[PDB]
Design a protein around this ligand. Structure first.
Ligand SMILES: CC(C)(C)[C@H](NC(=O)C(F)(F)F)C(=O)N1C[C@H]2[C@@H]([C@H]1C(=O)N[C@H](C=N)C[C@@H]1CCNC1=O)C2(C)C
Ligand SMILES: CC(C)(C)[C@H](NC(=O)C(F)(F)F)C(=O)N1C[C@H]2[C@@H]([C@H]1C(=O)N[C@H](C=N)C[C@@H]1CCNC1=O)C2(C)C
Lengths: 297, 298
């Protein structure tokens, strides 16, 4: 099953940021608050914003940053790509060890969905190959963040900005650079056709073998190039050299070579499951990374 | 539409490690009491057939090692309440949330904070099954992990983890130490009663699918409550009560689909199957979202 990281370290970093009547969420680390830059927009502004000109008309005293109902005075502001950095007069005493990372398609993370600076729920998400996430976000959720935790260190990888017409979600890394070709303007935008995350399907097949569900293992192997060309005919992502390497631990644990598992997946694509299940599922799951498999055990 | 858990921070601040002899598991530290599964006092041999009152009288306060992070909490008293041990410690938890202990009913959902050696590992959503098991994700050392819900800064603790059945589902207690289901904290093979599907939750999920634009399973037919329940019981679904119909009111109002209309859609799903189609990306009918869960997320 999907498991989110414990969210407590991130909960103590969530604040609300208001400009005029626009309120969204921000992330308070040390004495800086990070939030989506469209907080400075009026509803009419969002249709066609000039962020450089809009930010010129703003001063520190136009920004209301609150931890709960407690105001944190803003003493400086700057724009970095599509995020606003608000320097505040108080360093967050609950700042965790952290870093900012830009993730690849296929990688998973936990989202802490927040409204008015108040955490509401937590769930695991994957970055799709088309650079959207299949999230759960309502009005006011912008500035909610996605993250991973590794031994006391929080790696922030996503800040939420928008919802696309197909119901999927788009946002930035914590340096304000969008994942994908999207822009923070209220104008017609559309996600590209998506694909299946091959490396994660392979990880999930390894998990099935580890648990004794191994009927789909076949007696063939393939080359990575041959597999990549066939996979694309089924709307599956091609594998990178990095994908092969992150499957190494699971390949070692099961004694099933990566390219043997690739050949087994190829048969599943060309012939289906013939009514059978894998880990109880009739569908091939693609939002568990090799790291998620290892973490779950 | 995602299986969303409550933010776990308020509970993380309460998790500690409890050790007795060479048995280690998790405890929940609230004010000056640590609550944990009583089988922490058992050796490996004791667990095969424990007499807990006899085992407990032979322990002293100093046999219990409680660690909150790196700091040990001195145990100054102890008692047993059913299958839960209560350790009085000389230090009150400074981050004790507003909380209550509640016993939940089958079909209700809660968040689990899975912990190992007193340290939180992951958070996920579970339902209490009609047969009083839970389909959790728990490994060695997970005992004393808790399940909870949060309502406006108040934590309602409903579950503490004790054991895994041979089928791979899980059994535990409320925070008064009473098991959900006909199980006991003895290491011996135990089966649960045959499980059933949580009908009111399946209906809430079908409403979530319609809210999200997935309508292929709807039909023009309708049914009475009794005729729906006849088919539901035939397929090992729980009866739908009038209370359930009322609880679904907000979702019927939002979608403009009468509850008994949605029942007729579910009846055909049960009799015809999904024909290789999916609902909200699932090939099976999902029954671990309550109506409240759907309302909160949507
Ligand atoms: C769907 C909405 C049509 C209204 C619009 N979308 C498109 O214009 C697109 F279709 F082009 F994407 C859109 O998201 N926004 C319009 C305006 C901001 C953003 C926005 O309101 N963000 C919300 C943050 N609080 C989170 C949203 C709320 C609903 N669910 C979410 O996740 C910006 C791009 C500057
Ligand atoms: C599966 C195990 C066969 C070993 C046994 N099960 C049965 O004896 C049953 F069949 F009766 F359930 C069982 O769980 N235990 C044996 C012994 C305690 C409990 C136990 O080890 N609890 C663990 C807490 N740290 C959590 C477990 C570990 C694996 N996954 C879990 O969730 C007690 C009942 C006293």
């Amino acid at each position: 099953r999907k498991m989110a990281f414990p969210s407590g370290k991130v909960e103590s970093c969530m604040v609300q940021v208001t400009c005029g009547t626009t309120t969204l969420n921000g992330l308070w680390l040390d004495d800086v608050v990070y939030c989506p830059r469209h907080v400075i927009c009026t509803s009419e502004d969002m249709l066609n914003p000039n962020y450089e000109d809009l930010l010129i008309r703003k001063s520190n005293h136009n920004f209301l940053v609150q931890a709960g109902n407690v105001q944190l005075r803003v003493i400086g502001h700057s724009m970095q790509n599509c995020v606003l950095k608000l320097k505040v007069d108080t360093a967050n005493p609950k700042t965790p060890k952290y870093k900012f990372v830009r993730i690849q398609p296929g990688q998973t993370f936990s989202v802490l969905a927040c409204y008015n600076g108040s955490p509401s729920g937590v769930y695991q998400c994957a970055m799709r190959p088309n650079f959207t996430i299949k999230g759960s976000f309502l009005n006011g959720s912008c500035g909610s963040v996605g993250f991973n935790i590794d031994y006391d260190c929080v790696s922030f990888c996503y800040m939420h900005h928008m919802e696309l017409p197909t119901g999927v979600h788009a946002g930035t890394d914590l340096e304000g650079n969008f994942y994908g070709p999207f822009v923070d303007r209220q104008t017609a935008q559309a996600a590209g056709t998506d694909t299946t995350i091959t490396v994660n399907v392979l990880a999930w097949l390894y998990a099935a073998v580890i648990n004794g569900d191994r009927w789909f293992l076949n007696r063939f192997t393939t080359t990575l190039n041959d597999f990549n060309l066939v996979a694309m005919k089924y709307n599956y992502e091609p594998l990178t050299q990095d994908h092969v390497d992150i499957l190494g631990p699971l390949s070692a644990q099961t004694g099933i070579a990566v390219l043997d598992m690739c050949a087994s997946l190829k048969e599943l694509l060309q012939n289906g499951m013939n009514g059978r299940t894998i880990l109880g599922s009739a569908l091939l799951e693609d939002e568990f990374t090799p790291f998620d498999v290892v973490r779950q055990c």
